[PDB]
Structure 1
Amino acid sequence: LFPPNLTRRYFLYFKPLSQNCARRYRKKAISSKPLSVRQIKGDFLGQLITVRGIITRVSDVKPAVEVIAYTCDQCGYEVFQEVNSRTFTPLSECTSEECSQNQTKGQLFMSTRASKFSAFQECKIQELSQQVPVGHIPRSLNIHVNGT
Structure 2
Amino acid sequence: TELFPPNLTRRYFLYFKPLSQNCARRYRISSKPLSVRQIKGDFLGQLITVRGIITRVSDVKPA
TM-score (norm 1): 0.37
TM-superposed deviation, 1:4: 0.9
Shift of 1:19: 3.2
Q: 1:33, CA displacement in angstroms?
A: 0.6
Distance in 1, Cα, partners of 2:5 & 2:22: 40
CA distance in 2, matches of 1:38, 1:46: 17
Deviations 1:79-130 (A, max 9, x none): xxxxxxxxxxxxxxxxxxxxxxxxxxxxxxxxxxxxxxxxxxxxxxxxxxxx
Which protein is bigger by CA-based radius of gyration?
1
| Contact 1:18–1:32 (Cα < 8 Å) also in 2 | yes
Separation in 2, partners of 1:56, 1:3: 37
Q: Which runs of 4+ in 1 moved over 6 A?
A: none
Alpha-carbon spacing, 1:31–1:58, altered in 2? closer, same or farther (3 Å): farther
Measured on the aligned residues, the alpha-carbon RMSD in Å equals 2.3
Structure 1 unmatched runs, 5+: 63-147
Q: How much has 1:48 moved relative to structure 2?
A: 0.6
> How far did residue 31 of structure 1 move?
2.7
Structure with the bigger percentage of helix: 1
Q: 1:39 and 1:19 mapped to 2: Cα distance?
A: 23
The structural deviation recorded for 1:34 is: 0.4
Q: Give 1:50 deviation, angstroms.
A: 0.5
Residues matched between the structures, number: 60
Q: For structure 2, list consecutive stretches of 5 or more residues without a partner in the other structure.
A: none
- Aligned partners of 1:19 and 1:32 also within 8 Å: no
**Separation (CA, whole Å) in 2 of partners of 1:42 and 1:3:** 36
More strand by share: 1
